[PDB]
Symmetry: C5
Subunit: 307 residues, 5 copies
């Protein structure tokens, strides 16, 4: 089994899609393995550029075809080169630009924390023909930087494992385990834009929804509740183009639900305090004292939403 | 007729478009067939990588060109390899990433159930020159998982059939039937986002539309109905970017129609109860008792919409 | 002149853009022509796959380069093959997936009827070197089916013509007429979505705009007219992302104009009935009897819009 | 210097983007130049198709590489051919489909007039090695036609010039002037859609904004002004997706500014006529006579905007 | 070390994305270096076009592979050529069209100033095998021009540096420093569109929000505040599609926050002046004199936002 020594240089991370859970990684990759000695012009190494590599593969040079597992679409390679040494070791350098994917959990959406993963694997050689001896990742350009609204925290984590495929078992009996290199990069979301853009106006709308009971006329109370309903609908659209259709509920979706519930409970209590009459002569003040109750109750609901 | 033994490994399913009825499938495909024996260096098999395959096809190796029938655009192949054995059998492995299409029925749209189909076929060899002997599908990565808002239920279904083309009948008389492999994967839509995002606010808007008759002044009644009309129009736009232009009506479109009908019937009954006078002196209470009738009637309409 | 016999199999039609007047057609194309006899291994035909065709064109095989005239961007060919016979006839089969365009007339937009056109032509051989003898179109998959909101009606129409180019006249004097194959497929738009989505709410808004004159207070009348103006503006945006910027007026644009005119005429008549005073003491009822006139007049306008 | 005789056939113009100032041109291009005589099979010309051209360029045939200067992205060539004559002249025909750009001036935006420009140039040969002798443009398909909302007026204008590059001056001293072919096609915008879609409702909104002073109650006057402000904001969004972010002001942006100024001046005059009191007892009619003044003044502003 | 002399001609800059912080640069690049003498047909130089370059690289010609470092996706090369001299010097000319990226600071967003950067680097040769001797940039087409809403100010700045990579240190010990060419182009944003489109209506909305206290009835005061809240929400959406999700706050986002705070403070003071009673009989004028205070206070807040 040939011992390949991979080394990855993450040049930049960008294009982080939350609706699609993809991200674009641009970088270089250097593989290195020892073969048999050869005769090079002079005694220096020999550099072979892009379209001259297959002229060497045709004459019997063994270059493995590494691939990225978690990629979305075939990656965009740029330049590539071989470096052949008279000592015998071959070095394959190549520039990649790929669109990768990972499982993201958005249950704390503005105050989020995910990781960007790169999974590299030989396409056709098992660990009985090719194994990765080590892996070195050089995130110098993204070490502690604010790429988008994403804080990259610390040094990347590397791992080498063996993955078994139940397909190819009829092709290679018991020699169907492949080496795999995994690179993980932790990232923390910067929640500031969602604070001054989504949390503050929705909180003020819920406060102004509590502030309906300080009116008098039944008609103004209902029309006020309906204008506030229209504002909540506008903010319900405006939060839909930042986050996918998740089965659970985030903070902002819970605030939209809280605004809807505030308006509906205010309408219900207003209609009830208008209809709770003897015949038509009664006026209610035992139930219009929720100027302090509804802030207390909905503060308790927000607190139990925090826990 | 050469007996080809295909084996498909679905790596991931993503990008499920409802507006376009497409979905992206990424995976591998392994074909395998026996030919004539050969001389391989040593006695092991011989692995031939991407650009070295056509150097073998030029020297007379028979590799068939399988294709995907239901694809949208030419698929994106990545790496590929041949494995030639001294026994005589050839194995062709290739990675595909395609954008497939299928006929979807959205008549129960949030509570939906579709299937993802892969149709594979030889491009140029009929069943008198090439037939598929078996098909094995390995959906281990998507066996019971929540890819998007889509539950993949159970193991995939495979089938092998013979399709006849009336074109090529002037080219090949009666030898114009092709083998075809079909793979079906059942998927169930997770309706939670449409519950807490579309059903609940539209239901509350219809309830608040019933709640107009508890006012008095004709003017406040009509202006209230018009603000509710504006809210229904906002939710009519907001449901248009989740679902295509279907000739039938889903649950959410029926709720939009129900909100429009609620507002229109309230306006009509309000104007009628304002104009049903002797000359100008009458006031009506025999028709303002629909505080209980309109919930009953529109509940009956919703119930008959359920059945 | 070589007599080429083309045969087209329309596999599917999709992606019909109304804003761009394009549509995507996926299918196969089979050309066939007789040459000189040859020696084939055995006595069967000989099938030549994708990258092996140019190895035969280099050795002097005459394969013409047909093209699609009305395409938008270079088409996406997939697989292709030659079938060479010892009798002498060559058959060229190829799979195409193209984005075609056609002149559409949207003057009856929801109740529309267009046709999808495919124009095929030799790129470099006039009708003195290559002519199309016949054309057969096999629309079995789209014979009477609802692809989108588009009904495909009946069998396709084929035609063979000769087109003259005034460029290349300095290149080929009087031998500059090319054969051309035209395929037309009639399609009828399914108007249901535009009925229950655009016609019904706009009609109800125009009815509710007529229903303003049943109020009293000048202020409520004007504020009601302005809320209805806001609703008409919302529906004016909501109809703009279904149809391009046409110089003429469709049904839905005429309904938007009718809603604007209804609101403006109501505002004008309301202000006039408020100002038509002696000094400040008069009230008008000779002009507030348009509760029946405005439905009659605007019904007459809608009727003359029908004719 | 070889005298090349270019001839361009504009097949269609489409995809005219105003936000990006690009347009897609699809057509053919025929270059023609005389070389040295040769031996052709028979005595006719010899047609060489797409992938057989480089087999002739490898054996020493001189084909120049013309390019399009003002293109956005590398153009999409389709088929191409050579026509070699025993007389000695070579003709190079090729189909192009490109996305070109030009400087557009939108200062009269609905009543606009631009031109579509094609700039062709040799990539590597100066006017001392290659010069264009003439240029013929055949716009028969777009001679007087309504492609989109764009009238193509008359025959195209052609020009041949010499462009000097200060780069390549260290490469070629004083032989760094290149021939250039320019084609200009005048186009006039059809303003009808912007008339019945943007000018008419904004004018009616400004008229209804003048119509606020015919009310009484200070509160209804301010709430009416605010509903009209909301309608102007809706039309301010609705005009933003038709035109880029220009530093100057078009007609529709000036109408939006006029609506804002109408609402603001009405609010200011209403508040002033409410506060211009003795202590709290005065009512003003010397300033509420702007029912005729504000149409006159804002008509004067619109007139001076015309000039 | 070979001394390469690069020369860049910026043909155009366009496609400036603020949401993605990319920009498209189209231009040419000329490298030049001296080698060993050769025999050219005649005594002139020898021009080698696109697909004939690799026929010379196969026979042992040394052409380096320069690359662009800060590019997003692999660049789009068009034509390219070699110019070989009998003196010995080789000139490599190529046309590039790339989508580059740079770190932009939007803290003064309408009154902005950024720079467009091009970073070029050899892919495989260190400064011990290849170094850049000089760099000349010819921005004649964009010298002082208004490409979009971006003023290009003056001549470009060039720099040549040496970059060290800690990856490839196990590959090349201490010979792992690469030459790098950097080109910077200063650009100033034209703030006019944001002045007459975003600053003026938001300022008028804040003024009209101050103008609420000149009313009387508690109900009209609250409904007026809520209509103004709805207008602020509309302008809060309308400013979101011009600028990314930045952690800091620009001028327009601060104006949106100021409008929200104006409405909330007005609602709070109105409710307080309605509830600051003895029991129910008091009316407050000591706190309704903020007709002059709120302009003063919020003018002070805007002034401290300026500093």
């Amino acid at each position: 089994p040939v011992d390949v020594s991979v080394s990855i240089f993450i040049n930049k991370i960008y294009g982080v899609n939350t609706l699609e859970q993809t991200y674009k990684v641009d970088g270089y990759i250097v593989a290195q393995w020892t073969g048999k000695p050869r005769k090079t012009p002079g005694d220096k190494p020999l550099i072979v550029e892009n379209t001259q590599i297959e002229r060497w593969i045709n004459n019997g040079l063994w270059v493995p075809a590494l691939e990225f597992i978690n990629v979305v679409g075939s990656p965009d390679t740029g330049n590539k080169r071989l470096m052949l040494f008279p000592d015998g070791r071959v070095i394959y350098n190549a520039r990649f630009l790929g669109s990768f994917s990972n499982d993201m959990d958005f249950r704390l959406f503005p105050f989020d924390r995910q990781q960007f993963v790169l999974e590299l694997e030989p396409f056709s050689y098992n660990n009985q023909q090719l194994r990765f001896s080590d892996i070195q990742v050089y995130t110098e350009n993204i070490d502690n930087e604010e790429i988008d609204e994403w804080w990259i925290r610390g040094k990347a984590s590397t791992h080498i494992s063996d993955i078994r495929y139940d397909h190819l078992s009829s092709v290679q009996p018991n020699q169907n385990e492949f080496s795999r290199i995994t690179v993980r990069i932790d990232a923390v979301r910067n929640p500031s834009y969602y604070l001054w853009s989504f949390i503050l106006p929705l909180g003020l709308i819920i406060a102004a929804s509590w502030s309906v009971f300080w009116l008098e006329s039944f008609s103004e109370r209902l029309q006020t509740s309906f204008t506030l309903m229209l504002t909540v609908v506008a903010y319900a659209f405006y939060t839909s183009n930042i986050l996918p259709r998740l089965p659970y509920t985030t903070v902002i979706d819970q605030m939209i639900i809280a605004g809807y519930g505030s308006i509906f409970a205010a309408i219900l209590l207003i209609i009830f305090a208008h209809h709770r009459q003897a015949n038509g002569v009664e006026d209610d003040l035992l139930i219009q004292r929720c100027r302090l109750a509804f802030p207390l109750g909905f503060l308790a609901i927000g607190c139990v939403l925090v826990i």
